[PDB]
């Protein structure tokens, strides 16, 4: 839900030279490396390590006419009793929320740069 806005704002600042690229050229390893760098340079590095170790990058469906901003998604994997807490419907809700709020953040960045 992007509760810490500083980590995400700085991550998008660093990623804009990346996320501006067409989505067809995005590969997960580069974006996970960038996420790690953003976390360590931001306060997100102080989130619990159990959270971080399950904090994954989800790539969205790649379609032409898109850039890395539209294809980058965060993901949170679950296992153990936590997975009993977070079912597939929870994850689809989180995904819809992500796809809306990321676009809102994109538009906010757009207007700030405007």
């Amino acid at each position: 839900l992007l509760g810490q806005g500083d980590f995400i704002r700085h991550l998008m600042d660093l990623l804009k030279p990346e996320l501006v690229r067409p989505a067809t050229t995005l590969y997960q390893h580069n974006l996970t490396g960038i996420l790690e760098t953003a976390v360590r340079a931001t306060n997100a590095q102080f989130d619990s390590p159990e959270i971080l170790k399950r904090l994954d990058v989800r790539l969205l469906e790649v379609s032409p006419g898109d850039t890395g901003w539209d294809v980058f998604s965060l993901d949170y994997h679950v296992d153990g009793p936590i997975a009993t807490v977070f079912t597939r419907e929870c994850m689809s809700h989180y995904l819809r929320a992500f796809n809306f709020l990321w676009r809102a953040k994109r538009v906010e960045y757009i207007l700030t740069d405007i």
Binding site: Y27, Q28, H29, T32, G33
Partner: protein, 63 residues
């Protein structure tokens, strides 16, 4: 031997063959990275193209 035959032509040819093999192996390394988040292949890429001697060639081979 055959390599011995050329003082500098052989050196150039061997360097070219080594570069071709290196590009091959590096592509295989990137495949292993894309198949296994292989920190080792990510490290190999980051080492081999830090000053950009290989970086452009690795990008071109990716292309």
């Amino acid at each position: 031997p055959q390599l011995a035959s050329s003082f500098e032509a052989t050196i150039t040819k061997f360097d070219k063959n080594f570069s071709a093999h290196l590009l091959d192996l590096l592509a295989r390394l990137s495949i292993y990275s894309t198949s296994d988040c292989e920190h080792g292949m990510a490290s190999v890429i980051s080492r081999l193209d830090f000053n950009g001697f290989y970086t452009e060639r690795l990008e071109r081979l990716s292309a």
